[PDB]
Amino acid sequence: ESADLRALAKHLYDSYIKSFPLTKAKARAILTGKTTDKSPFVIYDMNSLMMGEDKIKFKHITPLQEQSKEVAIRIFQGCQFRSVEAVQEITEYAKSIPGFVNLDLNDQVTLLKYGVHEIIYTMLASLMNKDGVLISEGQGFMTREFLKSLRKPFGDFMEPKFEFAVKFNALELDDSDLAIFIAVIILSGDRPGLLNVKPIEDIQDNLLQALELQLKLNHPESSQLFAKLLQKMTDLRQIVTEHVQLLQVIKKTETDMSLHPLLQEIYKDL
Amino acid sequence: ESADLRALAKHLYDSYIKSFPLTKAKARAILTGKTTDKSPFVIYDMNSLMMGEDKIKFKHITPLQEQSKEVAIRIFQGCQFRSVEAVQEITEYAKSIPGFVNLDLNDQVTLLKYGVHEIIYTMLASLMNKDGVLISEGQGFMTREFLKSLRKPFGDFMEPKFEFAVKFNALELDDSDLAIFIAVIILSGDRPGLLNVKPIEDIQDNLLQALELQLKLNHPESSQLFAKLLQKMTDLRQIVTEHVQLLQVIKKTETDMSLHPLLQEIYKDL
Ligand SMILES: CCCCCCCN(CCc1ccc(O[C@](C)(CC)C(=O)O)cc1)c1nc2ccccc2o1
Numbered sequence: 109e110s111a112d113l114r115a116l117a118k119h120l121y122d123s124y125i126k127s128f129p130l131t132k133a134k135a136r137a138i139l140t141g142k143t144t145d146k147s148p149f150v151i152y153d154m155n156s157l158m159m160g161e162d163k164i165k166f167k168h169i170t171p172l173q174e175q176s177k178e179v180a181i182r183i184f185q186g187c188q189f190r191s192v193e194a195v196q197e198i199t200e201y202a203k204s205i206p207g208f209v210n211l212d213l214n215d216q217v218t219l220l221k222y223g224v225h226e227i228i229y230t231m232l233a234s235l236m237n238k239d240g241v242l243i244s245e246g247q248g249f250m251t252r253e254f255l256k257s258l259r260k261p262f263g264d265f266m267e268p269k270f271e272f273a274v275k276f277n278a279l280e281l282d283d284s285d286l287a288i289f290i291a292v293i294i295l296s297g298d299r300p301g302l303l304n305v306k307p308i309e310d311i312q313d314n315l316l317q318a319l320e321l322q323l324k325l326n327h328p329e330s331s332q333l334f335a336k337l338l339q340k341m342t343d344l345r346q347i348v349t350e351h352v353q354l355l356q357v358i359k360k361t362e363t364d365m366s367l368h369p370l371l372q373e374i375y376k377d378l
Numbered sequence: 379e380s381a382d383l384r385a386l387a388k389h390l391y392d393s394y395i396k397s398f399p400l401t402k403a404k405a406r407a408i409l410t411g412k413t414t415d416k417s418p419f420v421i422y423d424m425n426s427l428m429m430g431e432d433k434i435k436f437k438h439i440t441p442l443q444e445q446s447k448e449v450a451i452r453i454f455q456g457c458q459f460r461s462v463e464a465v466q467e468i469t470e471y472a473k474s475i476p477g478f479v480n481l482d483l484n485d486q487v488t489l490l491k492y493g494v495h496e497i498i499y500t501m502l503a504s505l506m507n508k509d510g511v512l513i514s515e516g517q518g519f520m521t522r523e524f525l526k527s528l529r530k531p532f533g534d535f536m537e538p539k540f541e542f543a544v545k546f547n548a549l550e551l552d553d554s555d556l557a558i559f560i561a562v563i564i565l566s567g568d569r570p571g572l573l574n575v576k577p578i579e580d581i582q583d584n585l586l587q588a589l590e591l592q593l594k595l596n597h598p599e600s601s602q603l604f605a606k607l608l609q610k611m612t613d614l615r616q617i618v619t620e621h622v623q624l625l626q627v628i629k630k631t632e633t634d635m636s637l638h639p640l641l642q643e644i645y646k647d648l
Pocket residue numbers: 128187188189190191194195197198225227228229231232241242243250266351355367371
């Protein structure tokens with residue numbers, strides 16, 4: 109019954125709105141302007157960066173950065189903190205996916221460990237366009253060029269996210285679509301180390317039917333959107349793998365820089 | 379129309395049968411199961427290999443294990459010969475895909491270039507089970523044990539493919555399904571360097587529709603098989619990536635000597 113699938117879709121969309129403070133709808137409203145209400149301050153260089161810590165709250169350094177925790181590192185610990193923040197929002201969302209909390213506690217942990225970053229990059233795309241990305245709840249906007257100009261290793265951390273975002277965003281998905289998609293990502297029975305794969309795949313199948321109908325009803329004219337979206341899951345895994353190896357490089361070139369315990373746990377070069 | 383999709387399906391199945399000697403239906407009869415007659419020669423040890431090699435249809439080298447070209451190298455090289463063969467079979471199959479030959483020639487070469495490894499492992503799964511893989515047109519069977527026991531570098535070469543095959547084969551696809559799936563892989567759109575993505579994605583759209591109808595008619599009891607199959611591409615990709623990686627490492631094993639050229643030419647890297 110497609111009626112039961114529509115309810116699941118509404119339920120997941122509802123939980124999504126309740127778990128994620130900055131939706132795609134809000135992100136696009138901020139980026140596309142035509143607004144005086146919430147135009148973001150723009151960071152495209154060191155100076156605007158300094159200024160940025162004025163109209164927008166930023167627990168980081170404004171002045172000199174070199175001999176005082178450089179800008180690259182400052183921006184990096186910022187992403188770090190924001191990522192853990194996202195893991196907590198995604199975890200809250202996960203618990204709302206029917207069946208998720210009734211699974212083996214060990215597998216709940218495994219599903220989150222492997223799904224969190226894939227979800228992070230999917231949602232990160234909502235806050236990006238070809239020119240940059242929204243920051244601090246949408247009050248700021250850091251330029252893609254400014255980011256690609258950071259010190260040797262940090263200079264290329266974000267580029268692959270942008271490359272993915274521009275392609276992914278061309279699919280023109282809205283929050284109700286993404287809510288089902290993120291749920292699908294989490295319930296992957298092919299995650300390494302899962303104990304009970306069957307209960308996980310039973311839920312994903314239900315989620316997949318939900319996503320399929322949702323895309324057919326919401327995008328009547330977009331041929332094979334469902335399949336096209338599912339293939340994007342390959343680009344996500346790649347982004348993760350690529351990010352991981354870059355993180356191993358960072359770890360060795362910056363022995364004075366620290367990683368958040370949560371993020372470190374999830375990570376295992378995995 | 380459902381008619382254009384069935385025709386496309388039937389057309390691909392026919393060309394697939396004509397292009398690939400060993401069909402999965404053919405290989406499954408041999409593997410797990412009997413169909414008692416002409417049982418494959420089993421390579422499970424060094425002695426069984428030496429014997430099988432000198433008694434199998436392997437046009438290349440003979441058994442010589444004594445400070446002269448180790449077994450692992452001869453096995454590895456052997457898989458290279460068969461891979462070059464398959465590439466030509468994949469190439470002929472590609473040309474039968476409606477619209478393929480009509481694409482920009484550089485684009486045709488690009489699609490084949492980046493799609494042959496994904497296709498090779500996909501079809502390899504057809505000849506594998508959890509304990510081994512069919513060899514020499516199915517006249518042989520090299521056990522998973524003997525393979526994982528090879529030298530340090532070569533022992534971890536095929537294992538990852540066995541793991542993928544185990545999961546992939548659980549989908550229980552047959553040649554009619556695989557025929558369309560392989561064509562979808564070939565007509566990707568995200569291969570690097572493509573010049574005209576539109577016609578490529580347009581054909582894949584048509585192929586995906588065909589694959590979807592085929593799975594629903596051929597496996598009416600398998601819910602969301604279409605979606606599950608597409609997500610298996612995330613695995614194939616990692617496999618390929620991980621594979622070119624070990625490959626580079628192998629290069630850092632065997633190298634020198636003015637003997638073997640022209641042969642090294644015929645292979646390169648694929
Ligand atoms: C439901 C989840 C919503 C996810 C929203 C993510 C916003 N974000 C963080 C993106 C990110 C960047 C870098 C990351 O690297 C770390 C922290 C490295 C340990 C990781 O977790 O792998 C991880 C995640 C982010 N936003 C921005 C804006 C500008 C510059 C950098 C930046 O990073």
